[PDB]
Each structure stands twice: as structure tokens, then as C-alpha cells.
Subunit: 298 residues, 6 copies
């Protein structure tokens, strides 16, 4: 999904170029992310986190991926959704400690979580293990033998107790850069009867740097779609790109991206080389988007 994102694509003066390092348009957010990167580099981001507020499919995840790439090539990047913390399989503490340990790298670069799994056939099936892993890593670091980026999408799904965990996590030196994202304005803090901007408590909000993403133009949507086709090794007609950019603007960038793979399959079945308007057309009528599926049910 973010194969193309190779950095934030900014010049020497931390100013974004229209298309560079995989990133297309979204000038202001990429400019703001640039200031955040230099803040992280100059050691000023300490104790603070990032909130990217924007409508779905506005490169919130892409900017988080770009920040990781810009911080370094070995920098661990883990993206989770707020809802993921609520599991039948594990506690919210476990869900969160795992997301954090997946975001702290150890250059022998391997994540703390990967080291936890290795020292522990099908998902149809310990504090001590982590205590031993943390001890060996402390020994190796002292002998002289990398905190990444943690992206939390749909952050308004987290409850007050989870927010306290994130807050206490920000107090650690070895903690990764916390980047949260939402599309919500005022909402209730889960586990609370109070409303708050983005559904985040005042204590955490006061420690955040809020960045906003604007929705893409017809020209920007087409460019992102052309980049995704290259990533999936799919060739399209210029007229098919126009149809897809329209389908994307009327529905979502995610639904337009979902169609690329299906349209390529239809084109390959037709014993074809380049995906034409009729392939995108067939696939659009076959596989519904949230707007059509919910309206057909009503």
C-alpha cells in the first residue's frame, strides 16, 4: 500500500516538491511533516506526539510512512487502528505493548517484538520472555554490539485507559514517534460522558502537534493512481485512468485502488495487455463501494 513512499520529498529548506520520493501533492501537510522531522532530528519533539486530522484517503498513513523513511532506512514503522486494541485474542495492554515493541528496532535491524516471538504452525491454537529479551538487549547495548514510528489510525476508538497508556509511553526515551490520525471533529472520549476534539483527552491533546490533510484534486488523484498501478505492475489506458480518477473522486481513493487489482484480473482473463475503460467499468459494477452497498440495503 505504501511501497512507493520513499520519504517526504522535501528540498534543503524543508519545502515540498510537487512529486518526489513517491509523495504527490499534499504540499502543506508534507511541509508541516518536514518541520516535525527536523524537530525529531534536533531532539525537540521529546514528550510530544503528532495528530494528522483529515478525511479518509488523504495520505495520513502515507505521511506517517514518509516520516519513517525520512528518519532512516532501517527505522521500524508499524501502523495500527484504534479498534485493533479490542481483541478476543489479547488484552489492550498486550495489544499496545506489542504495537510499541514492533516500533522499537534492535540493530544486531530487527524489532523487539520479533525477538519476543522468536524466543517464545497456525493461529488456531509471557512477561518472563520479555524480561529476558530486555535484559540481553541492555547487555548488548552496554557492550556496544533504533526507535521507529508508531501510527495509530481511527484514534477516537481508543478509550480513556488506552490514552493514559500512550501518555505514559511518551515519557520514555526509547519510545517511538507516536503519530495518531482521525477524520472526526468533536466526539465523546470512550469510557467517558465528555466530548473532546478528535475524541482525545485534554492532557494528551495539549502534547500534540496537529497537522491537517486536504482532499486530492483530479490531477493529484490520477498521479497517485498511476503510481499504485506501477507498484502492482499494472498498465492502464489514459482513458481508463480518467475513468478511475472519476470513480475515486466520487467514492474514495481506497475503492479506486481496490479496483486496480480486479480490473487487471479481468484484463488478463480477456487475454489482454493494457487495462481499458471497459475493464474498470465491468469491475465497478461488480464490486460495490460503501455508498452503493448501504443504499442498495435501504
Amino acid at each position: 500500500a505504501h511501497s512507493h513512499i520513499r520519504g517526504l520529498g522535501l528540498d534543503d529548506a524543508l519545502e515540498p516538491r510537487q512529486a518526489s520520493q513517491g509523495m504527490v501533492g499534499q504540499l502543506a501537510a508534507r511541509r508541516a511533516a518536514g518541520v516535525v522531522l527536523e524537530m525529531i532530528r534536533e531532539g525537540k519533539i521529546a514528550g510530544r506526539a503528532v495528530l494528522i486530522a483529515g478525511q479518509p484517503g488523504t495520505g495520513k498513513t502515507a505521511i506517517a510512512m514518509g516520516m519513517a523513511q525520512a528518519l532512516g532506512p532501517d527505522t521500524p514503522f508499524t501502523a495500527i487502528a484504534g479498534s485493533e486494541i479490542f481483541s478476543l485474542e489479547m488484552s489492550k495492554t498486550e495489544a499496545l505493548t506489542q504495537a510499541f515493541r514492533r516500533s522499537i528496532g534492535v540493530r544486531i535491524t530487527v524489532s523487539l517484538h520479533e525477538i519476543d516471538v522468536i524466543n517464545s504452525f497456525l493461529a488456531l491454537f509471557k512477561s518472563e520472555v520479555r524480561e529476558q529479551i530486555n535484559a540481553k538487549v541492555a547487555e548488548w547495548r552496554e557492550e556496544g554490539k533504533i526507535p521507529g514510528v508508531l501510527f495509530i489510525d481511527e484514534v477516537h476508538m481508543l478509550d480513556i485507559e488506552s490514552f493514559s497508556f500512550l501518555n505514559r509511553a511518551l515519557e520514555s526515551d526509547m519510545a517511538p514517534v507516536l503519530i495518531m490520525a482521525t477524520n472526526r471533529g468533536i466526539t465523546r472520549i470512550r469510557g467517558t460522558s465528555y466530548q473532546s476534539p478528535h475524541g482525545i483527552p485534554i492532557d494528551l491533546l495539549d502534547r500534540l502537534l496537529i497537522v491537517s490533510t486536504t482532499p486530492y484534486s483530479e490531477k493529484d488523484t490520477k498521479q497517485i493512481l498511476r503510481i499504485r498501478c506501477e507498484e502492482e505492475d499494472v498498465e492502464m489506458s489514459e482513458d481508463a485512468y480518467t475513468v478511475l480518477t472519476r470513480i475515486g473522486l466520487e467514492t474514495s481513493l481506497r475503492y479506486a485502488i481496490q479496483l486496480i487489482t480486479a480490473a487487471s484480473l479481468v484484463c488478463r482473463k480477456r487475454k489482454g495487455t493494457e487495462v481499458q475503460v471497459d475493464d474498470i467499468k465491468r469491475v465497478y459494477s461488480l464490486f460495490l463501494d460503501e455508498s452503493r452497498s448501504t443504499q442498495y440495503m435501504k
Copy 2:
């Protein structure tokens, strides 16, 4: 000592006729073939999904069939299993089935998944779990011991199979924690094809104060291929009814009345009447007035 040996949704036999999706070489549906009648678009879409699964492109994704009740959502899921192969395990459950006094939601879900992973010695992982457990002797909790599953998984790994299809109807009944389980399940290589179904538009996600399309979180929705089913015509209803009569082993005028009863109520209620009308006929309209449908029973 693991010991491999059972009829599934075959016990009710409601999909006896479904022998595949009945699509040609170009993945295009024929009006009536392999038990499937009409429902061209959904069967066409299911064809693209089958080729996606075959060419290894369905990886990380699942299917959502949105449609009014009695529109072949289960039939298309049964057809996809049959099309994937003859040995392919198929298990169809309802979202509400996860909520049990007998076992946890994790157990209910791990069992539904293990019933959908076949081992070609083809027998399900769950069948192997039940056979190698301390049971009529268990007739009148329902969880399989972790140790028993650990042994079964070990012997299967040593011997090494065929991941089938898992159909979850009334999916809007599942809560946020259950959806996280399905999401994590989709990350596994040996996972079956997940096919969910609903008749709901926007609804609250259970265990949440937020509304969402089909009551599914955005995280899972973004990983789904949404297919829709349209209700059947008079001609299509009659054909499905004629297929069911053959399966259960019948005047042309009686078929006209049943096709009307089916169009005015539901295809399921019309199908329910076939067996009862046959009993009355063997003893020597009556059956419709005797056995009520949801609409009449609630109104009376």
C-alpha cells in the same frame, strides 16, 4: 495418538443442488447450471473472486455478500466452495452463534475456523479435535482442550492442508472484538476464504457507539470485496422451487401457487412448504394456512 475418522450444513440439505457457480470458461454465468439459477451479476462477481483466489491474489482480503433474505447469499458461498474443489470444506454459521453459554467467542470462532481447514489423509481439523477428545457420553463446557489441539496441530504438521470456505451470515451481530479476530485470521496463510453476509445498511458496531456500513469496522471493510444479490423474478423463483422439489424427490398449477406464495413471503418459507405439502399429499394451500410465515404470525 491422533486418530482421523461427518455431514456439515449437508444435514439440513438446503444446498444439495449447488454443485458449483455454473460459469463458463470466460468466468461468465449460464442462466441455469451446477444447481445455480439466475442471479447473474453476483455469480459473475463470485467468478472474479474464484479466479482471484486461484491466482493467489485474494490474499489478505475477504468477501461481503449484501442482500435481502433468500437471495442465494449462502448458495453463492456454497457454490464458491464447490468451484474451489470437491474436497474443499464449507462451514456456514450465523454471527449470533458466537454468543454461547457452552463456550467463549474465541472458542466459537476457533471452532468455525478449524471446521473450515481440511486435512487430506479430506477431514476437518475440528472433526479430528472432537474424535481425539473425552466425549453421546457428552450429550447434555463445549470447548476443546488446548492440549488436544496442540497434539492435533503437531501430528498434522508432521504428516504434511486444504483451507476451505467459512460463511458468516448475520455478520452485524458480531462485536468489535470478534471483528479483530476475523481481521487477525485473514493474516494467516492456512486461513479459509472468509465470506460474510448481511441485509443491513448503516448500523452500530456492537460494543461501540459508532455507526458503520453493514455494522463492520473501517479496518475490515477496507479489506472486503462487496458483492450484492437482487431478489428473484417469478420465472427464477419457480426454477429454484422446481430444483428443490427434485432434490427432496408437483402439478404445474401448484408450482404457480408456490411461486406466488414465495414472491409474497420468502423463498425460504416457500421451500419449507414443499416437504409439508408432500406429507399432506401422501396422507391424501392447506399447508400455507396451517404453517405461518414471520409476517402473518407477528401480525396475528
Copy 3:
């Protein structure tokens, strides 16, 4: 002993036979169900009797048990009974099922605290006791089990987890005939924010045969009341029967039946003044609730 007279249900009902009076259509429908159960076609379906209270829903269930055979166990419970301080819903339900195969009587007899020794103590049967009982029954069956009828009244009181239990129970071959009853149309499924016909989930509803009961006429009410007087060995004046049939039609068949015993207590043949005294002494739900709304 409210159904003492019920001795059973050409599947065409006779106006009065085997204790059953009137209720022609429902008894006719029950006949088709009995032949379905006999010919092994009722597998893995259940019955829903939808009707207003006092319309013989329990009587038809009792009649179906009697018709299936004389030995056939019959247990009638209310949905609300599953909710106990003394035992879990699983236990409450496993007991109702084991009383319908009794297997439960065998469980009680071979259990530590029983009878007076169990009378108001510090309610569940140990799993080990049931494992031993199930083993001996399996041994006896092999050396050389009659599943009965389980009636669940006020079914809309059951929650989604209890419905899952009934659903899984229907998958068993040794399971009794499940007959549920309600007087409700659309209602919320307990433990859920969704409404549904009779408060039953679609999964179970799709497996039900719905039968409906109509209320009794003046002539039908009088006949049922005359049968009950005989069963309780009570004799009444023809004028007292007229008054009771009126009291029954204005209130309920159950309240009219409740009065029979009290009028007999209140001196050879029960006259109108005895039924009159007893009516003013013992109130029915309609009058007691209206008197409180003051």
C-alpha cells in the same frame, strides 16, 4: 394437574375427544406435526405456538406428548425460569432437556444432597454424576431412551446465548421435540439491540413451524370448565356453570379454573352465590392492576 384431562390431541379434529375441546385448527396443525415427528421429518426443526394466554398452547403441547406415546416425558418451563440465583442458564437448560429424555430424575437420585437433606440448603448436578449416569445408560442401551417433549413458554424471555443453546440442542438425535410459545409479535432479542418476530433470532426462526391459537367461545369455555369440575370431583349447579363461563369469558380460562376449587371449599352442589362470593374474594390480573391504578 392443570392438564389431567388431556389424553391426546384422519388428521381432522373431533369437537371433544381425549380431553381436548374445540381449538380445531391448532389441533389439526399439531396433527400434521405429530405425523412429521412420527415419519422422522421434524428433524432439526422445532414448533412455535403463537397465541393469547389461556388458548390451550400448553394443552396442545401436553396433547402432542400423549399422542407420541404414554411413556413420553413432557416438561413445561417458562423462559424466565432459566434465570436463577440457584443455577446457571446452562444448568437450567440442561436440566429442562434431561427432564425431557427421566435422565434428570436419575441425576437427582444418584446425587449427595437430595430431598429433605437438600430442602433450603446453602441446585446444579455435578458433571461427574451426569458422566456416570450417561455411561450406565449407554451401557444399558447397548445391552438392551425415549426423547419426549420440551415446552418453553414466554420464549421471548430467553436471551441470544440461550437461543444458541436451543439451536445446538436441535442438532442432536436424542433431543426431545422442542415446542416454544409466545403471545408477542415483534420484540427485541434479549442481550441485543435488534428487534425480531417473537423475539427469536433469524437462525432459529428459519427452523420453526409456526402454529396459532384462537380464543374460546362461551360454549367451548363451559365445556372445558365442566371437564375441570369432574377432574377435581366438584359438582356445580347449571346456573353456577353459566356464571363461571361468563367470569371466564370476561377474565381468563385460568382464573375461572382457579375459582372451581375455592367455590367448592366455600353445602352439597356449588350454587351461583358460592361462585359469586369467591369472585369478589379472589381478584384476577385485570381487576387487581386496575384497583392499584388509583
Copy 4:
């Protein structure tokens, strides 16, 4: 000792206007008579009683009278529905105790035997008010080797939840169980632990097994008679004019509030170095100690 005077509920089960402590309330007393003969002739088996009436209409008095009529040794325990909800013990314990207080052993209640043969008896300490299962198992064994079931009165029954009602229902299946007499002043109400409404807040399962008896409020003449009986019981002498004032205060408020004033007015009269309680004593005490109507309004 609010029911000191109640010594029973004629030969034809017909109530006399004033006898065995009972005054007026003819119909309900008549109905209680039929219930007693039903219990005696073994017809009350599986059934219980519901007394529906406004507060202070002798619902408890009729229950006390039924116990006295059943025999002099017959145990009688009166509890309120709300009493089952305790920090000290479970609802099961609260209910098993109320039932065991209502089953007598010929020589004393089963509960009294449970307390005597239990450790913690001494004498605002810890600690659960529950009796050990083993202690009850030993007591039940000795009693089985060697029983007078009394009356259990449950007031404010609409306070019980669905699980508690299932306990009462299962209790009615026992042969050694006491006569269950419930009471309420409510019409249709929600069954606690349920989203459904029902007559008296009782489930249909239990309601279908109940004999509903209703109590009407007392007249000026009946209120005065009950108040005269209570004054004698508490050994309090009043002026005929003070009885008129109290009967008025009782009719405007409640019979319980009027009866509460008898003791306080006697204290004021004794302080005034008096013999007979006069109108001014009942008047002082009425203005000092408030009733629900005045306390809620003045609050």
C-alpha cells in the same frame, strides 16, 4: 409488636366485624379463610398468595392472622423485597434465611438452629452474615432423623428481580415449604432485571400460580377501632377527642403514621405529668414529627 392484637383471622369461614384482634376488612379476611381451608384440605399445593392494596390496609395483619389461624406454634416471618439486596449476604442467602426462619421444628425455626450451631455468634464485626453450607447440611440431617412449615410474608414484592422470582417459584415445589404471601400496592410495573412490564412486577409464570386478594382502605369508624386497639396494646390511655384527632390524622396521612404518634404523644403526656393523652399532646407531636407528604414538600 405492631400485630400484638392479631390472634387469628367463624366456623363457616365467615368474618365477624371485630374478633381475634381483626377489625373490619371483611372480604380480604373472608378470602384468607378460603386460602386457610385450601391449605388445610391440601388444595393450595404449588400455589401462593398476593395481597394487593394501598399502604396501611392490613396486608401484613392478614398475613399475621393466617399464621395464628394455622396454629399457635406456626412460624411467621415478614420481610420486604428490598431486604434481599444486602452487603452482608447474597440474595440466595437472604432468601434461604427468610425461608428457614419460616420452617419450624417442634420443641424453634430451622434458621435459629443454624445460628446456635454456627461459629461467629458474638454478640458490627467483619464479615458475611451467611451460614456455612456444612452447618445447614448437619442441621437438615438431624431434623430428617428426628416439622411445622409456617408463613413467609414478602412486602414490596415488585423490588425482587427475575432471578429471585425463579427462587420463589422453585421453593413452591417443596412439600416442607411455608405458605408464601406476597404484597404490593403497584399495578403494572417492570420486572426488575427485565425490559418487560407485568401486573405487580411479577412474571406470568408466578402470577398464574397466585391467588390475588385485595384490601380496601379503612373508614373513619374502622381507623378509630384499630387505633383504640393499638393504644391498649401499648398501654396508652387517650381522650375520646384525642382519638377523633388521631383518626383524622390517620385518614389524611396513613394508619402507620397515626400509630407512630401514639408512642411519642404518650411520652409528651408523661412529661407534662399527665395520665390521659389529650388533643394538645397528639397536636404537638404531629407538628414535631413529619409524615412523607409534609417532609417531601418542606425538604
Copy 5:
């Protein structure tokens, strides 16, 4: 070796220092100002009848409910009843909300409030004896009593009472904001009233009809019918300008504060417009300001400064909105 001591109670906040009894004559009739009590004639008269009822052993099985608006001497009357019952009589005042603790159960919170109200004249409370004969105790306990410890304490106290070494003196337990208690807590109070060694229970509220917590039903004062039927309800009226001034003059003496007659006028106005508690809170602060000004008598400007500095509930909530 069970070890008894006393300790300062509601005396630590000292708001009822002056309350030395109910100030009633031989005929149980209140004098306008006596034993610290000022005005509130009817409630004090009613409390007198309750005292004679407790003394003549007639209060048995019953409790008191004082219904009145905040700052109408509900706590003062409870304090006065304790003082009137005797000088050694333990008095503990709690709020309904205090039963809800992260540190202990509602049962513990309530058993402690009751054991703080039963004195042992070797006079020391049963709770104080529980603390002294418990593992940690004070600073060693700094950031529930064991059942065994209470079982031993109860045994020794029973033995000493029988021998004639000790005398158990049941005091007064005041429960303010009683409508905060739930149905289970009310059942505890009800069962407590059945004990012979139980203290006099005095509850208080400012509420009329309210829901019983843990219930969907409304009820007078948020108390169930079972307990209500066992209560003697007393009501308190709000104070006049003359009564407010007198209470304030008594508090100034108690805190050893001298005020100008004009400053008393301002404070009596501030008290009538806000609350008697807020006016009393200002006495200490105004004295501090006056002492800082190198002053002798607290004047209008001292009360004025302090009023604008320290807000009352009405102003603070309005400024926030």
C-alpha cells in the same frame, strides 16, 4: 494482649466546637440561645422529644431523619443530641458518598462508621481499639481491619463488660447526604437498627422525592419504604438575619477573632446571600488579612477583600459558564 488508649474526631475541622448540648429547659423546651445552639426552635424541640425517647428506652428499632436545606444546623442538632446524651458519648458524622471507596468495601466503610460510634469506657471507640491492635496503624500505614482482629476485640470487650471493668457506651452516628446510599447500604442500616449495642442513627438530606440508588423507583428522600416506616422525620428551616449574626458571633469567639459591628453586618449579608458555611469559611481568612494589615479588629474592608478572593459555589460555577 488487647490494647486500648482517645483521638480528635469532627473536632479536627472544629465547625461545632460551641455545640455543648441542645439548650433545652427542664420541660424539654428550647431557649433561644443556650449550650451553643441558636434559634431553630422547632427542630431542637423535636430533638428533645427524641432525647427523652432514647432516655426512656422507647427509640428502640427506630432512627432519625433531619430534612432541611444546606447549612440549617442538621449536623449541629446531631452534635447537640450526642452532647445531651452524655459527655463521653461518641459522635461520628459521615456523608453517604464516603461509603464508596477505592480503599475499602461499603460494608467496611459502614462497619467502621458504626464501630467509631460505639464507645468502651475502660471512653475510647471500638474502631480506635481496632486500629491500635492492627499491624500497620499510622505513619507505618501511610500510603480495612482484619476480621480476626475484630473477633478478638469484640471478645475482650464482651469479657470486660461482664467482669465490670468496661462499659459499652453507644453514641450517635450522623449520615449526611443519605440519598447517596444505595439499596444494599440501606439494608445494612436496617439490620444495624436490630442490634441492642447500636448507636443512635441520625440521617440527613435536602432532597424530597428521589430515585433509590441501585433502583429504578423514586421514593421520599431516596430512602426505601421499609426504613422510612422506622424513621422519625424532623425538618429544619433556614436562619433569619438575627439568627445568622448570632451563629457568626459564636464562631468568631470559638476561633478567637474580633470583628467590627459593621463587619458582622457584611458577613451576615454574605451568609444569607450564599451559605452559613461560606460565611464561616471567611472568618479565618479575614482574620489572617487583618493580622497581616497589623490590625486588631476585623473591619468591613477585610471581609470585603476575602469575599472577592475566595469564591462560593454560586460565583465559581457561574464564572465557568
Copy 6:
């Protein structure tokens, strides 16, 4: 280091505040009131009582609490927490609160160290991400409390967003006020009447009457253009940032239109863009990093 400059309440001998001293700027009445509280604590009159600072966000409620700690002494521990912090997946509300209190009680060995610091040192990288919980063993605290008793400077505990605490937490604070070695409790809110959490009753500031009747309520007014500028100039010096007089005017405007906290957040970012900060640097940074008002409005 948001309160680096706060070195005391900046009051004269007569407990009267000087416009700008000991880091404190303006807020004369609240600083004056805090002075009376300090002398009340010193003269032993604050016994059993706590402080409530009611004011809109960014009105120096935390600064006045920091100033009170500094005024009480140089060794005096100061811990500031938010009500919401008590609700943790890592520890109980009791633990959260006992830790906040033990962080506020100093032990002067000559050096002062908190009771909590002594608890951590004498208890069994990267601990927040290790497992873990969070809580300190009762036995460890029992030993630490014993040795400290054998061999105490109570500080200040500031609880912001106090209306987030439930009735059980308020009972903890109430019982904590009964201890002699307890710190000065300073609570703060911006709310008028609100429900007490864990209750169906509304109350001023969401605090029960029992605790409210024991509080000394102090109010903070919002800052003027002249006061805002001065606080911002002090913060720039603390962060070693140089601004143009025109840039200070823009920042004072941005602060008055949004919040003092948002204006302070910009100082660091504007310095980074600059690397003397001019109006164009503050302008760029304002358009890049949004404040709560703009971010929520853009999302709607």
C-alpha cells in the same frame, strides 16, 4: 519544563503581588488569594482543607500551583497530574493515586527525594514497554515506610481536570486530607455544574458536597494583551529563542485568539523554521500546526 520561570508567587511582605516577580506575571487576585492560603497552611489553619482553582484553560492554574510549591520551600516536591491519568490499563485508581501522593511527599536525607523515588529504586529499560504493571509491591512500601519512620517534607499535589475523577477517587482524596504528612491538595477545573462520575447527580465542578465544603475556591481570569506578551517573552528566554518585537505582537494576537498553550507550542517550531524569529516565521508555523478550534472545524 513549562514552568521553568516560576520561582515563587512574587508577593511582598504583606502577601501582596508585584505585577512581575519570581517568574509570575499579572494574575494579581489569584496570586493574592494563593498568598492567604500559604499563610493559612503556615499558621496551621488550612488543616483538613484543600484548594480549587477554577478558570478557563491557560490562565496559570498550574503556574499558581507551581508558585505555591516554590513559596513553601526550595526542597518542596511538586507533582501535577490530570484526573484522567488515574484511569490506567497499567494500574488501579488506588495505585495511580497512592503514587501521585507518594511523589508529593519528600524525604530530606543534605538532599530531598520523594517517597515514590525511594519505592522505585528499592523495587525489582524499557519498563513502560517491558510487560508489565506498573504497581509497586505493598511489602516494598511497608519496608520503605518503616525505615523512613525510623530515620518528611510534604509538598504540593496538583490535580487538573478534577471533574474526570469518580466518587470513589473523591473519597480517597477526602480520607487523604485527614493525614498530617499529606501534601497540599490543589485541584483545578474549567467546568461549572457537572455530573459526579459514578453518580446520577449534578454538582458544582463535578465535586461532591462533602469535599466542596472543605475547599477554598480561587478563580483565574484570562490574560490581557500586555500580560500574554510578557508570559510569551519569558518562555522565549527559557527556551533560548530570540524574537522580533513585531513577531511578539503577532504571537500575542495568536495567543489571545486561540490559547496561551498553542502560542507557547509555536515558539519552538518558529525557532526551527528561523534556524531572530520574524513575523513570517510565526505566520508559516501558525498555518502549518493547527490549534483545537481549526482542526475540529476543518474535520466538520
